[PDB]
Amino acid sequence: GTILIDLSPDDKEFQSVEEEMQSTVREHRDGGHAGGIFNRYNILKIQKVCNKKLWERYTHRRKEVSEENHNHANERMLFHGSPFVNAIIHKGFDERHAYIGGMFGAGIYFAENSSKSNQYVYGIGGGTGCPVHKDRSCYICHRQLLFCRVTLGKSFLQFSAMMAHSPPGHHSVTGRPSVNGLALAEYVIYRGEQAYPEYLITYQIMRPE
Ligand SMILES: Nc1cccc2c(=O)[nH]c(-c3ccc(Cl)cc3)cc12
Ligand SMILES: [Zn+2]
Structure with missing residues (x-):
């Protein structure tokens, strides 16, 4: 069902996704152990992920969530790194x-x-x-990340020093940093239907100069 459509680098949709990729890079407390040492990326390809069935799976759940949450899906665009990226899409x-x-x-x-x-592109740690x-x-x-549309609904705020079910009366968990200033x-969602893998980004991390 899935087709991948390449975006031109001249296309504002390409530019806006690259900008979110690039501007949300931070230093990690592992000094680069899990994910490498880099301040920015070389973006090689951005592709839109098109699957009608999967999209309708997502929009159905989104509607259910927002109806439980005063018409508020609390939808975000968020990154996901996994060794199963190719399965996911x-x-x-x-x-x-x-x-x-x-x-x-x-x-x-x-x-x-x-x-x-x-950090999770090649697996845990x-x-x-x-x-x-x-x-x-x-x-x-060459590495791949997904930039995903995600329905949070009523999110449970976990203050934190950095399949199951959502906490009763919530649709997701928010991991709020309580120590690492810049994090x-x-x-976390506990229903796969609450995310849609919208963009596949192919990239390299770049060696600092
Ligand atoms: N703990 C995390 C925090 C933020 C983002 C991610 C993420 O993008 N991926 C992951 C991840 C994905 C697949 C597997 Cl098998 C394990 C961890 C964690 C993860
Ligand atoms: Zn290599």
């Missing part, structure tokens, strides 16, 4: 894509910081790095 998000050991329980995790999702060089900080191998928020 064909079959949609489901329980196989959950971070089982996550600080907010077994759910599917999204980030405001692109560099945060970048960056795994053993790129399959070709076994290097978590590879500057050569952006992280979010």
